[PDB]
Specification:
Chain lengths: 447, 111, 66, 157, 172, 144, 270, 83, 112, 55, 71, 56, 115, 57
């Protein structure tokens, strides 16, 4: 139980199977998955305890975390991908599916919205149904890069009277963002309204995704011939640059950066060149990928994956490193018995050229194994040290309270802060805002 | 052990009925019908046949949970047309179509 | 241990083809795929039922019974 | 310029504009004197301490300086009569909403601020990832107050 | 097997059964083949388990052809050869298949990856881990609930739970 | 009921990144100020470059039965039946949307932004007189 | 040609598979028919097993499951009442069929036990039910267990009526092929491709029964799915034609039951 | 000591105070105790407590303790409930 | 100046990965650690060597040494800390426990 | 006693002797038994260097 | 006192017709009878279920009260 | 710390968790056996006497 | 070069196409797989014993485990797996299993306990 | 330990192993004491008689 969101009060619903069932958006504060995790349940035994749990530890009352000043819950997993695909400009639904999707909304008033296109065939856009799920009275406006009132890239977001006008819905809108839809709904309406919005959005998106389909395959990580040729050319150019640097250094013509030896600067240059080559190859592979790619769709939605994963899976695996440095010489001036003495080539020092799809040679396989071992050891040590630090910090600040005179005092009564946060404001009721007076020029300010 | 019995998804128990109509106050001339022990087999057919009707302004069905074999059907019809009449007409049309299909299949298989 | 009676995926009865499959494999002298096709299994769901089945019943029967 | 602040004035004014159906063409009914007096009344109505002596009054006055700056920036006369054009009723509604939100945003006495701070600091430490020392060892040496850190540094301008 | 039983693949992809569907509700291909298991695609890109998909494709090709497939490391087997063999069998280069919804019968907009995959059943089952206590056996020294599920023990309220409840403000 | 009418010869159709929605640019073949940028579903209404498409903005789709006497708000749209003729019969592409922006381009040019669900339209007029009766939701009708 | 509704066209007939084309029908009816044929047809199968002696190397539950998975003849399943609807105590000749299996190991080599060794001891009263289904050329059947010398297997089974919804052992159909719109004329799916769609995606075997799409033609938004190609494979308990007829009859019975319930409740409430 | 009526705390009800009064009233109604509102078809003690608190009909007194030791009494009806 | 530098160092450590933490928590931590004239490390020799309650101090570390010192000296545990109430099994004066609820006669005779 | 308890030594001085030398053979699957029969342990009695994979 | 205690019984009617089990706990009218194949306990009326012999034989109804014996 | 700072309590349950998209945000699926095992005391009072008698 | 792996790592197919932590997790969790541990069972009295009903050899065999007798004593089954987002009930790490396959004897096993 | 020179199963064939109720796939290498199989885990230690020089803090 790291934070206060690790234990919250729910409502009992009896189910005919022997397993705890909870909403998907609730797992994020709990930091739990469904791979074998077990979680405890406590039952109050009195009326006052029940009332305290209902009015203080309820799930809707913990949407906004006072730690990061951001919501701790949001749309995750395949729901994010479904909401991104549904809101796309080219997504159109027919009457038969629209009626079912409208009926799936628990609090639908009973009014069928007018379809966007009526003359050739009645078609409803996905944004219309998503806005139907969104309660009325919420106005959200976000402008991304190159976003205008007629944005052609469908970026940003603009909501008027609970109706989506333009912009794809992604992690920046219904996720754990600063000024996302969840935060605005929680601040404007009650927490129960936010919970109902969560439920309605999840239901409609899940139904649409079930009746549409989404998958992934091996072919999503395969690039065309010219892209692989370009990646190979980039890798060869980087290797040639590294070889030239090594040749220059071996002739004592290299100049060492101030405060560094002749070896540290050379190693830094080598690792910088290798990292730049890997980044360029990954960017080329990502650019080559089409909009119908499943991995690209997952990455753009933000539900799972990243650019580095796509790079390592399609173009090239990054250089394996130990504690930030390359593979050390385990033998006498050698990394493996299969190499030669005093070899400083990138391949011999732990640089992987192939990708996961292409397969790894035994040497880079061993280097990757060493990197994974280092990662596992780091996690094992870090969890213990962080647990001890957290216990000490909790024990050292367990008696600090805010009294009725707006002063922060400990158990002994000593004054630590004459006003909480130097402003006397609750953390969960603070939003990031910009001050126009400080910025701008004198002429603009006067005008 | 919390395994539900396998016969509870198609056998009517005690105290519950196959059909249950409750009026809907959200929209005029709208009712909600709850079916017990069937799901996803005849509900789609009923919804499609109701959508084929011209005096039905709304027809949808949903299953609240896969654990329980039940679904709710909502029908909204034009003024002067009882939703039960529309349901009866859809059932009769389905019966006639199924009988015609069976007769045609038997005739084709006979040769 | 013993051959399954029915295919797990669809439900085709494959428990009566083990002896025929062995006889085809042991004297008819053809590869596994053609023997599976000759038996009557066209979907890989049914093919995997007897293609990747281990007959451990003989090992159990090797021990002296009561 | 982007800093966290209690009350979002922009959302309030946008909601007022949407719910009052401003014509954006007809002349406004507001007056400069009325706007200034309303702004001053709203500034004086923000209470965080609610004291009667001089010390508590001064503390309350100087504990809302940033919020007063933001309110003055967002409620200038030129801005009201040019960009965010509201009528008298809309202006009064905006002022009342701002006051209510500010009063509802004040901290509640009895909160366990120490435990909240400890958890809010310890969670990123557990979520922390893997030459200046940084990360878990640096946090540990800061908390333990080490007399001899591994990587001391200086910065001279 | 039931809901909650732990099942893991041969590439470190563990999981548990969340729901169980009958044959009719499961999606089906044009040949009437229904999958035994369904895995969310949101687990591949994060873990970069390409070997899972490669093994699935190789197993599908082997089942179609009837000859055992070789998956030994550092071999000459490539994805292109497996794709060519699958195309020769006449299914798909990348193993994608067209599936139909089991509820309405409508064709799915997105094609679904298909193919056999080796799976193992782990020793952890929900039936051996579910516990519930209400005024059970007592201890002798501390007069506190006993330890262990086999002895009808009670859950432990640790210091972390205590300080979390402190932060929540629920003193009662 | 009618609020706008022009020829609006189109040019430079942009396929974009989508497969069913295309963004087109047009220009009136009469007034020398009107410009129109609209996204349409080419799957249902294919459009080629250098084409004339008579556009029309109407407050309501009802015929002379109702002289655009407002009303017809949140009526729970019903499927069309036999008869019940409306203004959509004459045209081949009818869309319903919401106006959300009223930016003034210049001293005489004004711009009106419409959102037909996920599709946006930017109509620019002149003298604030041609596009004067544009206040709220309206129907867009396009004739070949 | 009986009525202007659904039409059929059989492409191939066999004792185990039937191929036909559905016409002038909607997607919902075809899907409902497929689902009913999958998991709605009553069938006779072994439900309860009594084990008297078991000296084999197989557990009792193993043999019970294997026997329950053995198909049985269900031609006259309509003449057998449900166990829950019968007035008997446990079972009788009018609601169940009793089968006894006895096996002993005499030869030195392994002695296999087949489904043909099952013997019906109850009175069928002329009904064509209870006979194990044998389709092998050698006429042996499903291999139940293997015995060596000195091992004996004596047990008694009872067969009861049931549907595939309660348990998968009552399913009469193995796999049902459902396909429509061989070409993407309705645009009901989006084809994943790398360089080309037609080249990468193989053509279905049903593409020869429909006209190929014409290039440079507008998308027909008024066209719906009306032609379906279905292939039904039977386990062996019930013939394929009888399987389809029973599926249609079961769907009709369900609709009629819904109508009867509606009429009865309308009468009661009025 | 009690600070007369020159009190200086907040004229509103905190979340903890709301929870405590709701729990105490719920327990009191759960036991056989008089109710000063029209049940109107409610039978859950907690909902009865919220109904009583809706128009400030709860005869409870809040005693806010200053850190020094002094305390001022605040009536439930005079406490503004905005949360 | 030391407190400001400590806050800057803590912020740099926290913001190194990219996570965001509200200023109030770090400010409270640095104010608590620098309440006296110098640093008070969060260790056995730091905050656990103050004039707080004996039970609360002993609950963290060195349980029997602190109790032995308290017994040798004259230590009175005024007992409004959370740890002491937890040990004694009483309602801690935190959250909902910071106030007492009383029933007035005038409201009873006025409501009824 | 040494083969059963796993403490290499006599009954006395058990706390000063190595523990875990003898373990019950893991028989859950063939692979588990094979892996258990080919296992080595490094008695360490905090340090990441001995746990890293060397060249 | 109660005859239905530790005697093998067969469940009649309902969804468990023909099942074999042994009654363990009997209280009032409902009788808790375990199941052989299924690892669950079902509570049914003692009158509904028939009574059999432990070794094996003919089955009888709840008339064992008159007989005051088994079999 | 093992008996006073933190102890073991009754009326607690623990089992493997699972996902359910059809459940609301503030809802937990409790198994029937766990619900039967756990109990909550209710004071016998008017407004619920009939329900309590039915449950008994 | 494939002989540098251990007994547990020799079971993983295509280990060079996988991340090293994934291989480590698979090697660690392989010992918990269910299967026929020995053919001597039914004659041995062990505290715990789990035997799969219908063990199946893997389709993607490796040359390394031919000498490990994995094909003679398999610890798993070959099941058709579809990677899709169906009904939203398999999110995070959950999976959807066919009821008909389970009823037909998929992944069921036996449990033996001795007192 | 099993399958040693002093064990009865060293020279046993497949038929003898089957007769003795022993699995032919068993590998041995463990000890059978008190009816429970025990396996000796290999212990890792630094090699002796090796001159090693290190740098102190
Ligand atoms: Mg987990
Ligand atoms: Zn099959
Ligand atoms: Zn009978």
């Amino acid at each position: 139980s790291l934070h206060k969101m690790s234990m919250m009060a729910h409502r009992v619903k009896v189910i005919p199977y022997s397993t705890f069932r909870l909403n998907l958006s609730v797992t994020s504060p709990y930091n739990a998955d469904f791979d074998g995790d077990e979680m405890n349940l406590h039952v109050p035994q009195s009326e006052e305890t029940r009332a305290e749990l209902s009015q203080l530890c309820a799930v809707p009352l913990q949407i906004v975390s006072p730690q990061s000043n951001k919501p701790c819950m949001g749309i995750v997993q395949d729901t994010l991908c479904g909401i991104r695909k549904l809101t796309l400009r080219d997504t159109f639904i027919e009457l038969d599916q629209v009626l079912n999707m409208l009926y799936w909304v628990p609090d639908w008033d009973g009014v069928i919205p007018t379809p966007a296109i009526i003359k050739p065939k009645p078609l409803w856009s996905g944004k219309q149904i998503l806005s139907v799920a969104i309660p009325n009275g919420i106005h959200l406006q976000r402008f991304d890069e190159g976003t205008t009132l007629l944005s052609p890239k469908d970026n940003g977001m603009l909501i008027i009277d609970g109706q989506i006008i333009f912009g794809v819905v992604e992690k920046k809108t219904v996720g754990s963002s600063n000024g996302g839809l969840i935060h605005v709904v929680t601040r404007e309406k009650g927490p129960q309204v936010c919970a109902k919005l969560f439920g309605n959005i999840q239901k409609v998106v899940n139904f649409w995704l079930l009746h549409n389909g989404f998958s992934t395959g091996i072919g999503d990580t395969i690039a065309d011939g010219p892209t692989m040729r370009e990646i190979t050319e980039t890798i060869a150019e980087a290797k040639k640059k590294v070889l030239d640097v090594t040749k220059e250094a071996q002739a004592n013509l290299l100049t060492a950066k101030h405060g560094m030896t002749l070896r540290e600067s050379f190693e830094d240059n080598v690792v910088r060149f290798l990292n730049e080559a890997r980044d360029k190859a990954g960017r080329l592979a990502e650019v080559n990928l089409k909009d119908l790619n499943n991995v690209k769709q997952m990455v753009m939605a933000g539900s799972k994956g990243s650019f580095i994963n796509i790079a390592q899976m399609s173009a090239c695996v990054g250089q394996q490193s130990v504690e930030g440095k390359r593979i050390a010489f385990g033998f006498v001036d050698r990394t493996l018995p299969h190499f030669s003495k005093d070899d400083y080539s990138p391949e011999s020092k732990g640089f992987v050229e192939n990708s996961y799809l292409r397969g790894l040679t035994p040497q880079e396989f061993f280097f990757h194994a060493m990197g994974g071992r280092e990662g596992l050891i780091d996690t094992a040590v870090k969890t213990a040290e962080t647990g001890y630090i957290q216990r000490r910090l909790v024990k050292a600040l367990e008696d600090i309270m805010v009294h009725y005179d707006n002063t922060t005092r400990n158990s002994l009564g000593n004054v630590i802060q004459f006003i909480y946060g130097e402003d006397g404001m609750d953390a969960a009721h603070i939003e990031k805002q910009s001050l126009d007076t400080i910025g701008g020029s004198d002429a603009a300010f006067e005008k | 052990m919390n395994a539900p019995d396998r016969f509870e998804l198609f056998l009517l128990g005690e105290g519950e009925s196959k059909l249950k109509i409750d009026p809907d106050t959200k929209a005029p001339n709208a009712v909600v019908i709850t079916f017990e022990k069937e799901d996803h087999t005849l509900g789609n057919l009923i919804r499609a046949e109701l959508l084929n009707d011209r005096k039905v302004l709304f027809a949808a069905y949903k299953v609240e949970h896969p654990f329980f074999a039940r679904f709710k059907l909502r029908i909204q019809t034009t003024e002067g047309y009882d939703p039960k009449d529309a349901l009866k007409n859809a059932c009769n049309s389905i019966i006639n179509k199924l009988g015609a299909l069976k007769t045609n299949f038997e005739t084709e298989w006979n040769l | 241990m013993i051959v399954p009676v029915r295919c797990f995926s669809c439900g085709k009865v494959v428990g009566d083809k083990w002896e025929s499959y062995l006889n085809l494999l042991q004297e008819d002298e053809l590869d596994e795929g053609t023997a599976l096709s000759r038996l009557g299994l066209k979907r890989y769901c049914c093919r995997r039922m007897i293609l990747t089945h281990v007959d451990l019943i003989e090992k159990f029967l090797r021990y002296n019974p009561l | 310029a982007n800093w966290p602040l209690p009350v979002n004035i922009r959302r309030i004014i946008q909601n007022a504009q949407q719910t009052f159906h401003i014509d954006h063409t007809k002349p406004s009914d507001l007056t400069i004197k009325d706007i200034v007096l309303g702004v001053k009344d709203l500034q004086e109505n923000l209470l965080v301490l609610r004291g009667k002596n001089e010390i508590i009054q001064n503390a309350q006055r100087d504990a809302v300086t940033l919020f007063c700056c933001l309110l003055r920036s967002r409620l200038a006369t030129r801005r009201v009569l040019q960009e965010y054009r509201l009528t008298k009723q809309a202006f009064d509604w905006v002022l009342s909403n701002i006051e209510a939100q500010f009063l509802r945003s004040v901290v509640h006495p009895g909160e366990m601020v120490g435990v909240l701070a400890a958890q809010s600091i310890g969670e990123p430490a557990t979520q922390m990832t893997l030459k200046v020392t940084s990360g878990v060892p640096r946090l540990k040496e800061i908390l333990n107050v080490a007399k001899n850190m591994k990587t001391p540094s200086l910065t001279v301008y | 097997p039931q809901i909650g039983d732990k099942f893991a693949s041969r590439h470190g992809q563990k999981g548990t059964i969340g729901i169980t569907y009958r044959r009719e509700d499961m999606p089906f291909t044009a040949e009437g083949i229904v999958p035994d298991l369904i895995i969310n695609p949101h687990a591949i890109p994060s873990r970069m388990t390409v070997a899972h998909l490669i093994e699935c494709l190789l197993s599908k090709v082997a089942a179609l052809s009837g000859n055992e497939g070789d998956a030994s490391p550092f071999t000459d087997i490539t994805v292109e050869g497996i794709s060519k063999l699958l195309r020769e069998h006449g299914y798909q280069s990348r193993g994608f298949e067209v599936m139909y919804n089991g509820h309405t019968g409508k064709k799915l907009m997105a094609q679904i990856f298909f193919g056999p995959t080796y799976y193992q059943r782990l020793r952890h089952m929900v039936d051996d881990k579910i516990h519930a206590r209400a005024r059970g056996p007592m201890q002798v020294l501390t007069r506190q609930p006993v330890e262990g599920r086999s002895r009808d023990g009670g859950l432990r309220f640790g210091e972390m739970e205590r300080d979390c409840m402190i932060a929540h403000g629920a003193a009662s | 009921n009618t609020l706008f009418d022009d020829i609006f010869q189109v040019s430079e159709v942009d396929p974009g990144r989508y497969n069913k929605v295309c963004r087109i640019e047009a220009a009136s073949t009469t007034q020398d100020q009107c410009k129109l940028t609209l996204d349409i579903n080419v799957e249902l209404f294919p459009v080629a470059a250098q084409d004339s498409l008579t556009v029309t903005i109407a407050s309501s789709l009802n015929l002379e039965d109702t002289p655009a006497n407002d009303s017809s708000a949140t009526r729970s749209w019903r499927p069309p039946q036999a008869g019940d003729r409306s203004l959509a019969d004459d045209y081949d592409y009818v869309m319903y949307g919401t106006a959300y922006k009223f930016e003034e381009v210049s001293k005489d040019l004004i711009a009106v932004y419409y959102s037909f669900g996920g599709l946006l339209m930017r109509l620019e007029g002149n003298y604030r007189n041609l596009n004067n009766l544009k206040q709220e939701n309206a129907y867009l009708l396009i004739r070949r | 040609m009986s009525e202007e509704g659904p039409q059929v066209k059989i492409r191939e007939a066999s004792k185990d598979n039937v191929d036909f084309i559905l016409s002038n029908v909607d997607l919902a009816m075809a899907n409902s028919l497929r689902r009913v044929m999958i998991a709605e047809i009553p069938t006779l199968a072994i439900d309860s097993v009594e084990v008297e002696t078991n000296t084999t190397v197989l557990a009792d539950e193993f043999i019970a499951h294997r026997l329950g998975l053995i198909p049985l003849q269900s031609m006259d399943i309509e003449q057998l009442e449900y166990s829950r609807d019968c007035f008997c105590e446990d079972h009788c000749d009018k609601c169940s069929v009793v089968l006894t299996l006895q096996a002993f190991g005499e030869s030195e080599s392994t002695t296999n036990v087949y489904s043909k060794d099952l013997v019906i001891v109850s009175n069928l009263m002329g009904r064509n039910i209870g006979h194990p289904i044998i389709q092998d050329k050698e006429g042996n059947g499903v291999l139940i267990c293997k015995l060596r010398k000195g091992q004996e297997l004596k047990l008694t089974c009872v067969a009861k009526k049931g549907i595939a919804k309660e348990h998968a052992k009552w399913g009469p159909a193995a796999a049902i092929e459902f396909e429509y719109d061989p070409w993407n004329k309705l645009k009901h799916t989006d084809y994943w491709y790398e360089q080309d769609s037609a080249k990468e995606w193989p053509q279905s075997k049903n593409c020869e029964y429909e006209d190929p799409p014409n290039e440079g033609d507008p998308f027909d938004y008024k066209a719906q799915a009306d032609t379906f190609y279905m292939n039904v494979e039977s386990v062996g308990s019930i013939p394929v034609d009888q399987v389809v007829v029973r599926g249609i009859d079961t769907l009709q019975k369900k609709v009629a039951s819904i109508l009867l319930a509606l009429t009865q409740m309308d009468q009661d409430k009025v | 000591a009690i600070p007369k009526d020159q009190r200086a705390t907040t004229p509103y009800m905190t979340k903890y105070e709301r929870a405590r009064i709701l729990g105490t009233r719920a327990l009191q109604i759960s036991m056989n105790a008089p109710v000063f509102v029209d049940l109107e078809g409610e039978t859950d003690p907690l909902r009865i407590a919220m109904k009583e608190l809706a128009e400030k009909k709860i005869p409870l007194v809040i005693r806010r303790y200053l850190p020094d030791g002094s305390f001022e009494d605040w009536s439930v009806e005079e406490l503004i409930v905005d949360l | 100046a030391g407190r400001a530098a400590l806050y800057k160092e803590v912020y740099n450590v926290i913001a190194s990965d990219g996570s965001y933490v509200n200023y109030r928590h770090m400010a409270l931590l640095v104010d608590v650690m620098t309440t006296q004239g110098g640093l008070t490390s969060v260790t056995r020799h730091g905050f656990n060597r103050s004039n707080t309650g004996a039970l609360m101090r002993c609950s963290f570390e060195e349980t029997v040494e602190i109790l032995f010192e308290a017994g040798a000296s004259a230590e009175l545990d005024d007992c409004r800390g959370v740890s002491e109430n937890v040990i004694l099994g009483q309602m801690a004066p935190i959250g909902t426990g910071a106030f007492d609820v009383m029933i007035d006669e005038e409201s009873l005779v006025k409501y009824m | 006693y040494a083969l059963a308890t796993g403490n290499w030594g006599e009954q006395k001085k058990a706390m000063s002797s190595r523990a875990g030398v003898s373990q019950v053979l893991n028989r859950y699957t063939y692979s588990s038994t094979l892996s258990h029969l080919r296992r080595t342990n490094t008695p360490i009695g905090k340090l990441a260097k001995p746990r890293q994979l060397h060249n | 006192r109660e005859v239905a205690l530790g005697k093998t019984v067969r469940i009649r009617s309902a969804g468990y017709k023909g099942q074999l089990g042994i009654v363990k706990d009997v209280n009032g009218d409902k009788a808790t009878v375990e199941l052989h194949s299924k690892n669950k306990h079902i509570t049914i009326d003692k009158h509904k279920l028939t009574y059999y012999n432990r070794e094996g034989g003919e089955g009888i109804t709840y008339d064992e009260l008159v007989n005051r014996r088994g079999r | 710390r093992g008996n006073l700072m933190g102890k073991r309590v009754d009326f607690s349950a623990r089992t493997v968790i699972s996902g359910d998209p059809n459940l609301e945000l503030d809802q937990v699926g409790v198994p029937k056996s766990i619900a039967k095992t756990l109990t909550y005391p209710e004071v016998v009072t008017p407004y619920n006497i009939d329900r309590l008698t039915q449950l008994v | 070069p494939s002989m540098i792996l251990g007994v547990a790592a020799s079971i993983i197919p295509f280990p060079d196409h996988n991340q090293s932590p994934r291989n480590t997790y698979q090697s660690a969790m392989g010992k918990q797989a269910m299967g026929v541990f020995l053919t001597n069972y039914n004659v041995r009295m062990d505290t715990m014993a789990n035997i799969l009903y219908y063990p199946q050899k893997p389709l993607g065999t490796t040359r390394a485990m031919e000498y490990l007798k994995f094909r003679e004593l398999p610890a798993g089954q070959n099941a058709i797996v579809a990677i899709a987002c169906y009904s939203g009930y398999n999110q995070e790490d959950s999976m959807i299993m066919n009821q008909s396959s389970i009823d037909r004897g998929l992944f069921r096993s036996l449990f033996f306990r001795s007192y | 330990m099993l399958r040693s020179k002093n064990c009865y199963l060293s020279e046993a064939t497949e038929s003898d192993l089957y007769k003795l109720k022993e699995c032919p796939f068993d590998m041995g290498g463990y000890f059978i004491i008190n009816g429970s199989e025990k396996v000796l885990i290999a212990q890792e230690r630094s090699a002796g008689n090796i001159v090693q020089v290190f740098k102190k803090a």
